[PDB]
Design an enzyme around this catalytic site. Structure first.
Site, PDB file in Angstrom:
ATOM      1  N   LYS A  46      -9.025   8.984  -4.236  1.00 34.32           N
ATOM      2  CA  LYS A  46      -8.938   7.526  -4.126  1.00 34.32           C
ATOM      3  C   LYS A  46      -7.940   7.163  -3.026  1.00 34.32           C
ATOM      4  CE  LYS A  46      -7.529   3.506  -6.894  1.00 34.32           C
ATOM      5  NZ  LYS A  46      -7.010   3.088  -8.220  1.00 34.32           N
ATOM      6  N   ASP A  55      -9.249  -3.862 -20.834  1.00 31.38           N
ATOM      7  CA  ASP A  55     -10.498  -4.015 -20.088  1.00 31.38           C
ATOM      8  C   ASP A  55     -11.453  -2.804 -20.286  1.00 31.38           C
ATOM      9  OD1 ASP A  55     -12.102  -5.666 -18.131  1.00 31.38           O
ATOM     10  OD2 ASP A  55     -11.605  -4.055 -16.717  1.00 31.38           O
ATOM     11  N   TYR A  98      -9.235  -2.564  -5.771  1.00 32.47           N
ATOM     12  CA  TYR A  98      -8.263  -1.604  -6.292  1.00 32.47           C
ATOM     13  C   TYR A  98      -8.014  -0.412  -5.358  1.00 32.47           C
ATOM     14  CZ  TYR A  98     -12.489   0.724  -8.232  1.00 32.47           C
ATOM     15  OH  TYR A  98     -13.719   1.316  -8.391  1.00 32.47           O
ATOM     16  N   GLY A  99      -9.064   0.026  -4.665  1.00 36.18           N
ATOM     17  CA  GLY A  99      -9.027   1.148  -3.733  1.00 36.18           C
ATOM     18  C   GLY A  99     -10.406   1.679  -3.391  1.00 36.18           C
ATOM     19  N   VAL A 133     -12.800   5.045  -3.578  1.00 37.66           N
ATOM     20  CA  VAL A 133     -13.037   6.351  -4.197  1.00 37.66           C
ATOM     21  C   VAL A 133     -14.120   7.156  -3.478  1.00 37.66           C
TER      22      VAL A 133
HETATM   23  C1  SB2 Z   1     -13.059  -1.281 -14.110  1.00 38.48           C
HETATM   24  S1  SB2 Z   1     -14.530  -0.602 -13.286  1.00 38.48           S
HETATM   25  O1  SB2 Z   1     -14.755  -1.395 -11.687  1.00 38.48           O
HETATM   26  C2  SB2 Z   1     -13.931   0.966 -12.743  1.00 38.48           C
HETATM   27  C3  SB2 Z   1     -12.597   1.114 -12.358  1.00 38.48           C
HETATM   28  C4  SB2 Z   1     -12.130   2.356 -11.930  1.00 38.48           C
HETATM   29  C5  SB2 Z   1     -12.991   3.456 -11.878  1.00 38.48           C
HETATM   30  C6  SB2 Z   1     -12.432   4.760 -11.413  1.00 38.48           C
HETATM   31  N1  SB2 Z   1     -11.187   5.043 -10.967  1.00 38.48           N
HETATM   32  C7  SB2 Z   1     -11.149   6.351 -10.662  1.00 38.48           C
HETATM   33  C8  SB2 Z   1      -9.957   7.086 -10.153  1.00 38.48           C
HETATM   34  C9  SB2 Z   1     -10.058   8.063  -9.158  1.00 38.48           C
HETATM   35  C10 SB2 Z   1      -8.902   8.725  -8.726  1.00 38.48           C
HETATM   36  C11 SB2 Z   1      -7.658   8.408  -9.289  1.00 38.48           C
HETATM   37  F1  SB2 Z   1      -6.544   9.038  -8.885  1.00 38.48           F
HETATM   38  C12 SB2 Z   1      -7.561   7.426 -10.274  1.00 38.48           C
HETATM   39  C13 SB2 Z   1      -8.713   6.769 -10.705  1.00 38.48           C
HETATM   40  C14 SB2 Z   1     -12.511   6.848 -10.983  1.00 38.48           C
HETATM   41  C15 SB2 Z   1     -13.176   8.185 -10.923  1.00 38.48           C
HETATM   42  C16 SB2 Z   1     -12.454   9.334 -11.245  1.00 38.48           C
HETATM   43  C17 SB2 Z   1     -13.084  10.580 -11.192  1.00 38.48           C
HETATM   44  N2  SB2 Z   1     -14.376  10.683 -10.837  1.00 38.48           N
HETATM   45  C18 SB2 Z   1     -15.098   9.590 -10.523  1.00 38.48           C
HETATM   46  C19 SB2 Z   1     -14.518   8.316 -10.557  1.00 38.48           C
HETATM   47  N3  SB2 Z   1     -13.252   5.829 -11.440  1.00 38.48           N
HETATM   48  C20 SB2 Z   1     -14.327   3.311 -12.267  1.00 38.48           C
HETATM   49  C21 SB2 Z   1     -14.795   2.067 -12.696  1.00 38.48           C
END
Ligand code: SB2
Length: 309
Positions: free
Chosen positions: A31, A120, A14-15, A17
Site C-alpha cells: 500500500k 465500519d 486512504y491509499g 494498494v
Molecule cells: C473499507 S473498504 O473501501 C476497504 C478498505 C481497505 C481495504 C484494504 N486495505 C488493505 C491493506 C493493505 C496493506 C496494508 F499495509 C494495510 C491494509 C487491503 C488488502 C490487504 C491484503 N491483500 C489485499 C488487500 N485491503 C479493503 C477494502
C-alpha cells in the site's frame, strides 16, 4: 505510475494498494500513501501512525498484520467477502456461513478485548486468504457501507460502543444467506424504516436513549406502529438456530444486543466453538496518545515501533 518508484527502494502486479512478490518467493500486498504531504501534515500523519500502531498491536490469525513497515506491506489476500457474496456462480453453503461467521466474530472479539471498535464492518473489509480463512482490516478511523451501520450510528449517537460491530456482523450474516444486503437504504428515514419493518417498532424511550438531538428532531413527528416481521420471510435460507442468532445480533437497542462472547457461545457455533478461542492470541488494551501532535515528535515514535528492515 507506481511500480517505478520501488525500483530505487526494493515486486509488481486512504491509499493505493498493489500486489507483488517479496525479497524471497512470498506473495504480498503493498500500500502506497503519500499525498491527497500526509506524513508531514501533523493531523493526517497521526491518522497513518494510528493505522501502523493498530496493525502492529495485534498478532491474531483473524486480524491483518504488517509483514514490513509511505509504503506498507502485509500478506496478499485472494479476495474479499463482498466479491464472494456478489458472485452468484460461487455457492455459499450453511456450513460456509457458519465457518465465516465464527472467524468474523473471533476477529471482532480480539478487537473488543483490546478496546478497539471497528465501526465500519462490511463484506468489503472482510478479506479471504488463499487457504480460504477470514481476516479483518480497516479498523482504523462508495455509499453502500451505510447499510451496515447500527441504528444508534444512523441516529448519530455519540455514546456508541463495541455493540455497533454486532449489528454490522448480523447484517453480513443475513447477506450471506440472502446473497443480497439486508437493509439497503438511501436516506436517514428509509434506512430506519427498513430496519424497523424487519425488527419491529422500538419503544420511544429506547430511541431517545440512542439518538442525537437532531436525530430526535428528524423523528419528532415520525411515529411508527410497524409490527415485527417473521424472520423466516426476512432470511429464508437460514435454519431456526441461525435465525435465532441473527435476530439477537440485530437488536435495535444495543442494551439487548448479543455480546461477542455470547454470540460465539450460541448453539449455532456448537460444532466449531472451543472456549480457548475467546482467550488465545489476545492483545492487551490498545493505548494511543491522541492529545500529542507535532512535526518531528511523530517521526521518532515511527522508527521506535519498527524493528525489521
Ligand atoms: C473499507 S473498504 O473501501 C476497504 C478498505 C481497505 C481495504 C484494504 N486495505 C488493505 C491493506 C493493505 C496493506 C496494508 F499495509 C494495510 C491494509 C487491503 C488488502 C490487504 C491484503 N491483500 C489485499 C488487500 N485491503 C479493503 C477494502
Amino acid at each position: 505510475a507506481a511500480m517505478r518508484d520501488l525500483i530505487a527502494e526494493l515486486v509488481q502486479r486512504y491509499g493505493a494498494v498493489c500486489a507483488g512478490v517479496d525479497s524471497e518467493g512470498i506473495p504480498v500486498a503493498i500500500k502506497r500513501v503519500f499525498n491527497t504531504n500526509i506524513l508531514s501534515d501533523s493531523f493526517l500523519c497521526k491518522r497513518v501512525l494510528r493505522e501502523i500502531r493498530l496493525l502492529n498491536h495485534f498478532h491474531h490469525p483473524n486480524i491483518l498484520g504488517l509483514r514490513d513497515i509511505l509504503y506498507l506491506v502485509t500478506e496478499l489476500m485472494r479476495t474479499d467477502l463482498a466479491q464472494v457474496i456478489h458472485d452468484q456462480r460461487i455457492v455459499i453453503s450453511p456450513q460456509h456461513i457458519q465457518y465465516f461467521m465464527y472467524h468474523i466474530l473471533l476477529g471482532l472479539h480480539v478487537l473488543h478485548e483490546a478496546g478497539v471498535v471497528h465501526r465500519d464492518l462490511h463484506p468489503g473489509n472482510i478479506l479471504l486468504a488463499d487457504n480460504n480463512d477470514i481476516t479483518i482490516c480497516d479498523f482504523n478511523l462508495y455509499v453502500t457501507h451505510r447499510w451496515y451501520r447500527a441504528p444508534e450510528l444512523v441516529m448519530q449517537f455519540k455514546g456508541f460502543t463495541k455493540l455497533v460491530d454486532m449489528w454490522s456482523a448480523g447484517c453480513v450474516m443475513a447477506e450471506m444467506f440472502n446473497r443480497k444486503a439486508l437493509f439497503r437504504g438511501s436516506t436517514f428515514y428509509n434506512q430506519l424504516n427498513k430496519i424497523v419493518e424487519v425488527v419491529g417498532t422500538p419503544k420511544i424511550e429506547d430511541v431517545v436513549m440512542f439518538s442525537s438531538p437532531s436525530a430526535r428532531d428528524y423523528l419528532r413527528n415520525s411515529l411508527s406502529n410497524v409490527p415485527a416481521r417473521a424472520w423466516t420471510a426476512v432470511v429464508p435460507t437460514a435454519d431456526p438456530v441461525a435465525l435465532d442468532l441473527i435476530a439477537k445480533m440485530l437488536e435495535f437497542n444495543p442494551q439487548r444486543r448479543i455480546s461477542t462472547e455470547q454470540a460465539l457461545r450460541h448453539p449455532y457455533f456448537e460444532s466449531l466453538f472451543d472456549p480457548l478461542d475467546l482467550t488465545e492470541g489476545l492483545s492487551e488494551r490498545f493505548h494511543f496518545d491522541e492529545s500529542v501532535t507535532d512535526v518531528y515528535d511523530m517521526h521518532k515514535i515511527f522508527t521506535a515501533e519498527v524493528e525489521r528492515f
